[PDB]
Design a protein around this ligand. Structure first.
Ligand code: HEC
Length: 104
């Protein structure tokens, strides 16, 4: 877990689709300006699939670890064709940064 390291991990992994505040547009992932308490499906001005829509719980680091290790294991019928990430540190490092972004 580290905000500094995580700063450049999110984007290199997956900025092309997604934003944490600004600049990045609704291409193929919503701007994650509020996680960690905010819900699953209910993206601000975006067009998710009904698969994510059906999911109706809090996003949180707990849920994200599962989702980042393997999103297919949680919401597979979802447009996010994301492959995979480190394994076990990831869910701390990426999360370390995003827990900064959506929050301070
Ligand atoms: C473009 C090919 C993507 C990449 C690369 C990543 N994501 Fe993504 N994500 C994408 C879409 C189209 C969606 C919605 C799925 C649907 O049903 O249409 C998502 C969704 C998420 C969510 C959920 C947000 C919500 O509205 O509930 C999260 C938390 C998320 N994605 C995070 C995330 C991260 C951190 C990624 C890299 C590590 C990543 N995504 C890659 C498309 C794409």
């Amino acid at each position: 877990g580290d905000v500094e390291k995580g700063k450049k991990i999110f984007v290199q992994k997956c900025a092309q689709c997604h934003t944490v505040e600004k600049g990045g547009k609704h291409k193929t992932g919503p701007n994650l300006h509020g996680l960690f308490g905010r819900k699953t499906g209910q993206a601000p001005g975006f067009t998710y699939t009904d698969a994510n829509k059906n999911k109706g719980i809090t996003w949180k680091e707990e849920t994200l670890m599962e989702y980042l290790e393997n999103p297919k294991k949680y919401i597979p019928g979802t447009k996010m064709i994301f492959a995979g990430i480190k394994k076990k540190t990831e869910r701390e490092d990426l999360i370390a940064y995003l827990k900064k972004a959506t929050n301070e």
